[PDB]
Structure 1
Amino acid sequence: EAPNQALLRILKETEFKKIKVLGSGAFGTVYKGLWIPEGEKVKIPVAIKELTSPKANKEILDEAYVMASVDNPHVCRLLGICLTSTVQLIMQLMPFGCLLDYVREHKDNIGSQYLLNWCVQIAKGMNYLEDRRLVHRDLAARNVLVKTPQHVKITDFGRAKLVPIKWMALESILHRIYTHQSDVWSYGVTVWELMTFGSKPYDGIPASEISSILEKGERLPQPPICTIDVYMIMVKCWMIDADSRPKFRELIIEFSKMARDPQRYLVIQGDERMHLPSPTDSNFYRAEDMDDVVDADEYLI
């Protein structure tokens, strides 16, 4: 294979400042904060994921390795780690949080243009991961984050290589096999998640019954807003024969074609008269000294 020449950047604890907590969990915690490279005259918005027990520091470093190895517009890119008593991952702050919560809170303002554009953007992200011979193994709406409403990025790699049952292929649930095509399956579930505005797939059914249900030939329903054209693509992702499933490059193509005429393929009431925040808005840039702020996407080496 060719050699992984990614640079891992070690940052000083004084070079950035946490500002608030965004969430707490098993790992530890995630802070909204600000990274000022010393002597650079830039302030960069970041998220800071911090942890201590050795056999779990190995896991955080592993995620960091993965995330330093990727560079694509639709993959959240890591900026550096900071070595203190607890390891801390510094990555580009994604201001609107996870897409799953985003569609839940904003159902009434999400148009078909936004939906299909998301579907394209993720198909691109995953196609890039496939180029980089990477398998995600945990692709879901909870693991896509929202930079702007018009820009989402894949962001959890705590399971990537070279258990979330209701998102996984059949070969994966039964034989622990994972390939790019089982990632396609989870892409299909994800799409379902979006088109149902954050619904829970197989709500109620305990994850132990999932394997046998799928075995019989049952799948998720057709979201009300879906034409058959979109639902058919979801369904092709849920074939048993993994080679019968579409390849991410084709998913990109099909959702592109659909996102040219969005209202021919998703029927939403009040569509086209809907507004979400845009970088061409007022106050769109606040979350008090934004003098010299630069989005990470534009600070390079």
Structure 2
Amino acid sequence: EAPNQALLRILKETEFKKIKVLGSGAFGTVYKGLWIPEGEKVKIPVAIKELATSPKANKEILDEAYVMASVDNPHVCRLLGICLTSTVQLIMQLMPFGCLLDYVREHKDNIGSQYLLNWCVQIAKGMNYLEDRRLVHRDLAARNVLVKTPQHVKITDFGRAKLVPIKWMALESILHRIYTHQSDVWSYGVTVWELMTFGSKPYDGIPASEISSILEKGERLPQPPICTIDVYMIMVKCWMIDADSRPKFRELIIEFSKMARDPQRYLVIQGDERMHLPSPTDSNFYEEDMDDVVDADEYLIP
């Protein structure tokens, strides 16, 4: 097929500074940083992911770098560059509000119907881009959707992309290990359910092994209290046995966009209209020198 002409940018360790730790798990550690290129008079807020040094782990992080550098879309997280230190590290765009899952849980009392429906459009938009690029995500969840600003979200975590989370997986993905663009549609359905429930855990209490039988019996995730039958019908359509019967991401963009025009007709939230989330309208919305700071989305070299 088509040659992948993507540019892999190698960055100097001296060009960036680690400020604080954002998340440290089994993978290694993710830091909040600032990237000050050569003499460009700019400060780019970054997220640096560093890994001991084992040849097996280094191969895995370089494959994630391959996928991340191959994508480019307003609703998909891109790799800015890599630094070849003794350990090796990925330089990514800082998403100050973290993952959408923690965001909906922590801000439920101020998340209105407009935001929820706009996020659905945005996720479908990124997922439709991944489809056009012939790339299957294989791990779409509210935990893998990051928040740049409350009004702008992007899809991330390409550790399993390709050109186990059972409770987000499609039927063919569990029983036959079949991963298609339509199997990501099932994962999108669970993602939307997570949002509409304000970060509630899918199939809570139920073990992962029983899921296979439950889905074959016809049991699916319940209707969230805020959901009208209009929004729930879409979630249900994402969970059909026949993958071709499930909606396409371009249809999902259209469907949620129609709903985003009159959000109170499709999502019933007590306190809607009087709710508000941070925005560039806020006084001091944006530690050391914040003079010379620009986002990665605006910093582009020819």
Normalising to structure 1: TM-score of the pair? Answer: 0.99
Is 2:101 the counterpart of 1:100? yes
SS of equivalent residue, structure 1 residue 14: helix
2-structure distance, mates of 1:281, 1:137: 37
SS of equivalent residue, structure 1 residue 273: coil
1:38 shift after superposition? 1.0
Q: Deviations over 1:239-262 (max 9, x none)?
A: 000000000000000000000000
Residue in 1 that maps onto 2:257: 256
1:79 shift after superposition? 0.2
Residue in 2 that maps onto 1:207: 208
1:281 shift after superposition? 1.4
1:272 shift after superposition? 1.2
1:19 shift after superposition? 0.3
2-structure distance, mates of 1:242, 1:176: 14
1:53 shift after superposition? 1.1
1:283 shift after superposition? 1.2
Q: Deviations over 1:80-113 (max 9, x none)?
A: 0000011100000000000000000000000000
1:217 shift after superposition? 0.4
Is 2:222 the counterpart of 1:221? yes
Residue in 2 that maps onto 1:72: 73
2-structure distance, mates of 1:57, 1:271: 48
1:273 shift after superposition? 1.0
Unmatched segments (≥5 aa) in structure 2: none
2-structure distance, mates of 1:271, 1:177: 41
1:162 shift after superposition? 1.1
Q: Deviations over 1:139-163 (max 9, x none)?
A: 0000000000000000110010010
2-structure distance, mates of 1:258, 1:269: 18
2-structure distance, mates of 1:283, 1:209: 49
1:230 shift after superposition? 0.2
Residue in 2 that maps onto 1:186: 187
1-structure distance, mates of 2:65, 2:33: 18
Two-structure CA RMSD over aligned residues (Å): 0.5
1:23 shift after superposition? 1.0
2-structure distance, mates of 1:194, 1:98: 12
2-structure distance, mates of 1:110, 1:35: 32
Residue in 2 that maps onto 1:4: 4
2-structure distance, mates of 1:254, 1:234: 12
Q: How many pairs align? A: 299
SS of equivalent residue, structure 1 residue 153: strand
1:30 shift after superposition? 0.3
SS of equivalent residue, structure 2 residue 211: helix
1:294 shift after superposition? 0.5
1:296 shift after superposition? 0.4
Q: Deviations over 1:159-218 (max 9, x none)?
A: 100100000000000101000000000000000000000000000100010001001100
SS of equivalent residue, structure 1 residue 65: helix
Residue in 2 that maps onto 1:42: 42
1:68 shift after superposition? 0.2
1-structure distance, mates of 2:55, 2:212: 35
1-structure distance, mates of 2:283, 2:11: 33
1:279 shift after superposition? 1.4
Normalising to structure 2: TM-score of the pair? Answer: 0.98
2-structure distance, mates of 1:275, 1:195: 17
2-structure distance, mates of 1:129, 1:280: 32
Q: Deviations over 1:115-144 (max 9, x none)?
A: 000000000000000000000000000000
2-structure distance, mates of 1:284, 1:61: 35
SS of equivalent residue, structure 1 residue 177: coil
1:276 shift after superposition? 0.5
2-structure distance, mates of 1:181, 1:87: 35
2-structure distance, mates of 1:87, 1:32: 16
